[PDB]
């Protein structure tokens, strides 16, 4: 993930211009190799046409170039690219939205599962670790970085995500499918055991816990679904064929013919086709957007930081369920204890952001006196 929110906070002079100086996760870094190959092919064809052929062959090549230039269509490639990239971006944001965050569940666990003793600590930590284990299982199934971090369940055990007992239980329960669903059944059974043992005081609290755990399960299932059901290969191949056919016919139809022949559009020999290269940058970058976002769990610069998410989730959830359980700051009257209308101060740098309240669009409507009497 490349973040430039601070840079694009305000719509200043050249705000998007200053983003063109970035390298990581950029268009140049994405398509420099393709541009180099295109350059090599274009100039090889140019040299072949210029100083490798006879007069009749050059005339035939010029006829072919004139035939090719008219066959360069921008409406269809733009149309397919726009919708394909829109679909890819929508799926990418949905995939991020299905990343499981254990925050609600950990707050509920810390509140509900009672006991400041070792048994209560074990119960809370085991529940939140079941949640984290399910999350890391689906993440290592769907993300190459997480898989490289934990290439096996033995690696998961050595990293502390799984106990050896849990690993043995998983091996005993092994079926010819992905076993990421097992920790949710473990969580449900452990929560029922906690309620029966008196650690969870009410079945409504049990239901809230299981609802949050079910939401996490649904998010993980959506992640698995997005990993499994790819965008249709026919659609991807169609958009690729459009782009590459465009920039393969351009290789011939954008060649600088001899200016002596006084062609309508080939009166000048600029050597470099700057507009063809600009179109290459634009269209191939538009395609590279979809190329990068089609699997947002790879190792691209703009892919998600799944390893950081895993580490943060583990640390935060463990802290919340263990140290923060029934550990509150002292409850004391606040600064505005007897102030009916509190007014927090503004700094000198933020005094200009103090605004009057918006009371509605109809507030300033002016009505005459007679217009306001109720009619019988």
Contact by Cβ (8 Å): 247, 284? yes
Q: Is 54 in the site for a copy of itself (CB under 8 A)?
A: no
Contact by Cβ (8 Å): 183, 174? no
Is 303 annotated as belonging to a binding site?
A: yes
Contact by Cβ (8 Å): 130, 183? yes
Q: Is 206 in the site for a copy of itself (CB under 8 A)?
A: yes
Is 301 annotated as belonging to a binding site?
A: no
**Selected binder of a copy of itself within 131, 210, 250, 257 (CB under 8 A):** 210
Total interface residues for a copy of itself by CB under 8 A: 227
Is 98 annotated as belonging to a binding site?
A: no
Contact by Cβ (8 Å): 265, 69? yes
**Selected binder of Ca ion within 95, 276, 295, 306 (CB under 5 A):** 295
Nearer CB in complex with Ca ion: 12/261: 12
Q: Which of 338, 280, 308, 263 has its CA nearest to residue 77?
A: 280
Is 58 annotated as belonging to a binding site?
A: no
Total interface residues for Ca ion by CB under 5 A: 4
Structure tokens at 164: 């050896």
What is the footprint of a copy of itself within residues 345-374 (CB under 8 A)?
A: 345-351, 353-365, 367-368, 370-374
Alpha-helix residue ranges (DSSP H) falling in 52-117: 55-70, 75-97, 103-112
What is the number of alpha carbons within 13 Å of residue 238 lying toward its C-beta? 14
Considering only the stretches 212-220, 236-244, 300-308, 315-323, report the one whose residues sit in contact with Ca ion under the rule CB under 5 A.
Answer: 300-308
Which partner from the list a copy of itself, Ca ion, none does 43 bind, CB cut-off 5 to 8 Å by kind?
Answer: none
Cβ 52 to a copy of itself shortest distance, Å: 20
Which partner from the list Ca ion, a copy of itself, none does 262 bind, CB cut-off 5 to 8 Å by kind?
Answer: none
Q: How many residues does the chain have?
A: 376
Contact by Cβ (8 Å): 105, 311? no
Q: Is 212 in the site for Ca ion (CB under 5 A)?
A: no
Q: Which of 149, 141, 143 has its CA nearest to residue 182?
A: 141
**Selected binder of a copy of itself within 50, 58, 115, 300 (CB under 8 A):** 300
**Selected binder of a copy of itself within 45, 46, 115, 208 (CB under 8 A):** 208
DSSP of 33-55, one letter per residue? HHHHHHHHHHHHHHHHHHHSS-H
Contact by Cβ (8 Å): 239, 84? yes
Cβ 220 to Ca ion shortest distance, Å: 20
| Element holding 286 (H helix, E strand) | helix 274-293
Q: Is 221 in the site for Ca ion (CB under 5 A)?
A: no
Q: Is 226 in the site for Ca ion (CB under 5 A)?
A: no
Structure tokens at 167: 């690993």
Q: Is 43 in the site for a copy of itself (CB under 8 A)?
A: no
Q: Is 328 in the site for a copy of itself (CB under 8 A)?
A: yes
What is the spatial distance between Cα 289 and Cα 28, in angstroms, rounded to a whole number? 12
DSSP of 230-246, one letter per residue? PSPHHHHHHHHHHHHHH
Is 169 annotated as belonging to a binding site?
A: no
**Selected binder of a copy of itself within 78, 115, 153, 219 (CB under 8 A):** 78
Q: Is 256 in the site for a copy of itself (CB under 8 A)?
A: no
**Selected binder of Ca ion within 62, 114, 227, 300 (CB under 5 A):** 300
Which partner from the list a copy of itself, Ca ion, none does 41 bind, CB cut-off 5 to 8 Å by kind?
Answer: none
What is the footprint of Ca ion within residues 38-77 (CB under 5 A)?
A: none
**Selected binder of Ca ion within 69, 166, 212, 303 (CB under 5 A):** 303
Residue 101 main-chain phi, psi, to 5 deg: -110, 120
Cβ 16 to Ca ion shortest distance, Å: 12
Contact by Cβ (8 Å): 286, 85? yes
Q: Is 233 in the site for a copy of itself (CB under 8 A)?
A: yes
What is the spatial distance between Cα 135 and Cα 131, in angstroms, rounded to a whole number? 6
What is the spatial distance between Cα 338 and Cα 248, in angstroms, rounded to a whole number? 75
What is the spatial distance between Cα 93 and Cα 301, in angstroms, rounded to a whole number? 16
Q: Is 219 in the site for a copy of itself (CB under 8 A)?
A: no
Binding residues: 9, 292, 295, 300, 303
Known binding-site residues for Ca(2+) equal 9, 292, 295, 300, 303
Binding stretches for Ca ion (CB under 5 A): 295, 298, 300, 303
């Amino acid at each position: 993930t490349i973040t430039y929110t601070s840079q694009v906070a305000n719509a200043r002079l050249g705000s998007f211009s200053r983003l063109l100086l970035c390298w990581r996760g950029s268009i140049y870094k994405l398509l420099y190799g393709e541009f180099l190959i295109f350059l090599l092919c274009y100039y090889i064809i140019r040299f072949i046409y210029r100083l490798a052929l006879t007069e009749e062959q050059q005339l035939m090549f010029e006829k072919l170039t004139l035939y090719c230039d008219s066959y360069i269509q921008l409406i269809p490639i733009s149309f397919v690219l726009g919708f394909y990239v829109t679909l890819v971006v929508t799926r990418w944001w949905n995939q991020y939205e299905n990343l499981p965050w254990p925050d609600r569940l950990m707050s509920l666990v810390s509140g509900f599962v009672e006991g400041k003793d070792e048994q209560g600590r074990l119960l809370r930590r085991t529940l939140i670790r079941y949640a984290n284990l399910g999350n890391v299982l689906i993440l290592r199934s769907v993300s190459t970085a997480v898989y490289k971090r934990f290439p096996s369940a033995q690696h998961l055990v050595q990293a502390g995500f799984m106990t050896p007992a849990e690993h043995k239980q998983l091996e005993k329960l092994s079926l010819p499918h992905n076993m990421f669903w097992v920790p949710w059944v473990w969580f449900a059974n452990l929560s029922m055991k906690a309620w029966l043992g008196g650690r969870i005081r009410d079945p409504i609290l049990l239901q809230s816990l299981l609802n949050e755990m079910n939401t996490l399960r649904t998010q993980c299932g959506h992640l698995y679904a997005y990993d499994w059901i790819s965008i249709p290969l026919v659609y991807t191949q169609v958009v690729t064929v459009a782009v590459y056919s465009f920039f393969l016919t351009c290789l011939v139809g954008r060649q600088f013919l001899n200016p002596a022949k006084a062609y309508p559009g080939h009166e000048l020999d600029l050597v470099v086709p700057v507009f063809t290269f600009l179109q290459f940058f634009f269209y191939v970058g538009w395609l590279k957007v979809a190329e990068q976002l089609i699997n947002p769990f790879g190792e691209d610069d703009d892919d998600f930081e799944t390893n950081w998410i895993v580490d943060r989730n583990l640390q935060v959830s463990l802290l919340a369920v263990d140290e923060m359980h029934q550990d509150l700051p002292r409850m004391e009257p606040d600064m505005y204890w007897n102030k009916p209308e509190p007014q927090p101060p503004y700094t000198a740098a933020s005094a200009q952001f103090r605004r009057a309240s918006f009371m509605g669009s109809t507030f300033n409507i002016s009505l005459n006196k007679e217009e306001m009497e109720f009619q019988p």
